[PDB]
Curated annotation (Swiss-Prot), chain C:
From-to range in the entire protein, with total length: 252 to 284 of 334
Function: Auxiliary protein of the large-conductance, voltage and calcium-activated potassium channel (BK alpha). Required for the conversion of BK alpha channels from a high-voltage to a low-voltage activated channel type in non-excitable cells. These are characterized by negative membrane voltages and constant low levels of calcium.
Subunit structure: Interacts with KCNMA1.
Domain of life, source organism: Eukaryota
Protein's recorded name: Leucine-rich repeat-containing protein 26
Length: 392, 352, 33
């Protein structure tokens, strides 16, 4: 039992202008060298995580040497490359206290010395090597350099998922390490043999607050850190995610495109779409005495309807559809499939301040609809008689 | 701190209650039904209870113990629904667009302020960020005091990799310091074209120019002007240097001059618009007017210094050689003088 | 199996091996630049 040495190695390890400019240039993601270096170090972090996953089933303390097993040598090479990368990082920046406490720097400080001692010395120990899982936070970033991700929302979602998975795996490794070993004051005889995947399942049960209880931490250190993990999880859920989750939950209601059905014609109604005008138009058009029932009315107004107009649409949902858009925009005309529409009906604002302005607006709507599709019937309402001449 | 303190206080007090009740037994049960429970294990039980996990490894077995936990559950739900939630929502409030633009070396940025709405930003981004532009490293940072709405938010989002927004006014020097305007390449000021009174908006833009110049005199400012006669005020600023690069885009004079010169020769507005604006490449194979129109659009209007070989040659001869031998069309010449400032000459004659 | 659990010869260097490697890498980066 020599875990003290492998812990103290990392603990002790943790505790010109021209070359600084050169290092800043090389580390910078703006150049291709830095991009490729970050890609390589992320791939190596994934490899180290896979190595930890395999070694989880192995006994925590066992004597081995480099020539005995290859995977030990691959892990050693990964650690050497991480050491070179960390040296470049630390020498890159002007200030050094940030790199004295940087998250990636501290992860390297805690993961390199244990391997560096375990490669040649006996009693190979699966120490704090699960911290390599934290390198998945940078995952979203690499998708930016590889041009696969092109949307801010998608990048943010990938970053959120990566941070969630990184925290999950890091805490799972912590619980595995604390449970497989015992309480140091209890002479390590109170330990509980827990599979790493069982620890992941336990953490998933606890985060969701299901609490099945089939598996739980029994050591004092494990329970103390479980209490710390639920504290942190509740705090993060109340602080980190909720605003972003509400952002993801935001959605437009009436945006969309009309899904046409063959054999069922539709008429597109635009203009002054308001509760009174729509009410009158529906009580006349959709009167129960019409044998012509297959026609479907698609409304197109750029104002989002209020609750009363929403209810009016709800009552006749089987015949009435609504979309938010203006016939002036050709895209909104394309959405409602007006090229295949039987007819277009324009409602007029009868109670308008200036009748001539409203008539001009309706005429220009007619012009837009005709320009998109000349061979469509149009029935437009005219406030003033002398404004009809413009249609000629 | 008060919230955390009261949380810890009630947590430890209820844990002490459970420990006291469970270590002893029920008074009517002769205390022989007790459960041995360390105090820290009681704290752990309380925390796995309040988080509603409920492992079941540790639980109260006494009648009074299970009675208290029912009460501790009801009381905790009451405090979580009445006492804390308003303060919790208070802390969760955050200003979205507050912050400072963190400059990146080698990535020049321009600061855009003034009339920042959907239409102006839409037009300016459509024309500025045309895909043909090879000059891409320039980053646009917007500064307007009014928080953007949802659709302008989406417009900024679609160009998230090259467009940033920050809430503030250029009149306030702190907001100028937030966007790092001292290191900015240039500042553009957009004008409310459709305003009730152009004079007030022009005066507001002129104060914006004054504030930006006062913060840092050595900055280029491109400002839109609604009315021609308001440009004179820009001459009042000692820091306003036309030779340095400061320009006033007077919309009225430019639009009406385009229209008048079109009246003199129809299509000159299209001429100049296709000259200075930038377009994507479209190939037409079929013999239509559009093909020839594309080879017409292909040209762009440039400036460059003439070599010493043309010194001592008249403008018509220089234009002749440039067109015949170099396939370059001499349009204008910048004349240099000491008594007068540099002037543009349009088709100089033989004498010059 | 199980050659030796303790070694003072290697214990005199196990404490400094981590900082030794880190400082060597730092000095190599400084010199090569």
């Amino acid at each position: 039992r020599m875990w003290w040495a492998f812990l103290a190695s990392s603990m002790v390890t943790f505790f010109m202008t021209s070359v600084k400019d050169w290092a800043g240039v090389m580390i910078s993601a703006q150049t291709l060298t830095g991009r490729v270096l970050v890609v390589l170090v992320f791939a190596l972090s994934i490899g180290a995580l896979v190595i930890y996953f395999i070694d989880s089933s192995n006994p925590i303390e066992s004597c081995q040497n480099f020539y005995k097993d290859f995977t030990l040598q691959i892990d050693m090479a990964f650690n050497v490359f991480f050491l070179l990368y960390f040296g470049l990082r630390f020498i890159a920046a002007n200030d050094k206290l940030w790199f004295w406490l940087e998250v990636n720097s501290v992860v390297d400080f805690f993961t390199v010395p244990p391997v560096f001692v375990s490669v040649y010395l006996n009693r190979s120990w699966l120490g704090l090597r699960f911290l390599r899982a934290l390198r998945l936070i940078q995952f979203s970033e690499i998708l930016q350099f590889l041009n696969i991700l092109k949307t801010s929302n998608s990048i943010k979602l990938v970053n959120l998922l990566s941070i969630f998975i990184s925290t999950w795996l890091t805490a799972a490794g912590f619980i595995h390490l604390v449970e497989n070993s015992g309480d140091p004051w209890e002479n390590f005889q109170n330990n509980q043999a827990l599979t790493y995947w069982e620890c992941v399942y336990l953490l998933m049960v606890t985060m969701s607050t299901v609490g099945y209880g089939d598996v739980y931490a029994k050591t004092t250190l494990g329970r103390l850190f479980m209490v710390f993990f639920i504290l942190g999880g509740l705090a993060m859920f109340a602080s980190y995610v909720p605003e972003i989750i509400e952002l993801i939950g935001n959605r437009k209601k009436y945006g969309g495109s009309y899904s046409a059905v063959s054999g069922r014609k539709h008429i597109v109604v635009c203009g002054h779409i308001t509760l009174e005008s729509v009410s009158n138009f529906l009580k006349a058009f959709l009167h129960k005495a019409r044998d012509d029932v297959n026609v479907e009315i698609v409304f197109l107004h750029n104002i989002s309807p209020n609750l009363e107009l929403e209810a009016l649409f709800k009552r006749h949902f089987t015949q009435v559809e609504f979309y938010q858009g203006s016939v002036l925009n050709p895209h909104d005309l394309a959405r409602v499939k007006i090229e295949s529409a039987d007819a277009c009906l324009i409602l007029a604002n009868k109670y308008c301040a200036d009748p001539d302005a409203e008539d001009a607006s309706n005429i220009m709507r007619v012009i837009s609809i005709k320009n998109y599709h000349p061979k469509i019937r149009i029935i437009t309402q005219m406030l003033q008689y002398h404004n009809k001449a413009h249609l000629l | 701190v008060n919230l955390l303190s009261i949380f810890i206080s009630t947590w430890l007090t209820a844990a002490g209650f459970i420990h006291l009740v469970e270590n002893s037994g029920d008074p009517w049960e002769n205390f022989q039904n007790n459960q041995a429970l360390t105090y820290w294990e009681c704290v752990y039980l309380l925390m796995v209870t309040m988080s509603t996990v409920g492992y079941g490894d540790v639980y109260a077995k006494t009648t009074l113990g299970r009675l208290f936990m029912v009460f501790f559950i009801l009381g905790g739900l009451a405090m979580f629904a009445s006492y804390v939630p308003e303060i919790i929502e208070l802390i969760g409030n955050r200003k979205k667009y507050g912050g400072s633009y963190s400059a990146v070396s080698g990535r020049k940025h321009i600061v855009v302020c003034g009339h920042i709405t959907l239409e102006s930003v839409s037009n300016f981004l459509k024309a500025f960020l045309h895909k043909a532009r090879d000059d891409v490293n320039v980053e646009i940072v917007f500064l307007h005091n009014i928080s953007p709405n949802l659709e302008l938010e989406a417009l900024f989002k679609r160009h998230f990799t090259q467009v940033e927004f920050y809430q503030g006014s250029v009149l306030n020097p702190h907001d100028l310091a937030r966007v790092k305007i001292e290191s900015a390449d240039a500042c553009l000021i957009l004008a409310n074209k459709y305003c009730a009174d152009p004079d007030a908006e022009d005066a507001s833009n002129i104060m914006r120019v004054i504030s930006i110049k006062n913060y840092h005199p050595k900055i280029r400012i491109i400002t839109q002007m609604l009315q021609y006669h308001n440009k004179a005020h820009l001459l009042n600023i000692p820091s306003w240097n036309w030779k340095e690069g400061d320009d006033a885009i007077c919309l009225a004079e430019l639009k009406l001059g385009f229209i008048a010169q079109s009246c003199l020769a129809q299509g000159l507005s299209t001429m100049l618009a296709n000259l200075f604006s930038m377009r994507s490449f479209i190939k037409i194979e079929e013999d239509t007017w559009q093909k020839y129109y594309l080879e017409g659009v292909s040209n762009e209007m440039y400036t460059e210094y003439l070599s010493s070989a043309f010194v001592g040659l008249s403008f018509p001869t220089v234009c002749e050689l440039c067109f015949v031998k170099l396939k370059l069309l001499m349009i204008a010449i910048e004349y240099k003088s000491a008594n007068r400032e540099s002037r543009i000459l349009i088709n100089p004659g033989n004498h010059l | 199996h199980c050659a030796q659990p303790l070694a003072l010869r290697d214990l005199a260097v196990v404490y400094t091996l981590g900082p030794a490697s880190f400082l060597v890498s730092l000095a190599s980066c400084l010199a090569l630049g």
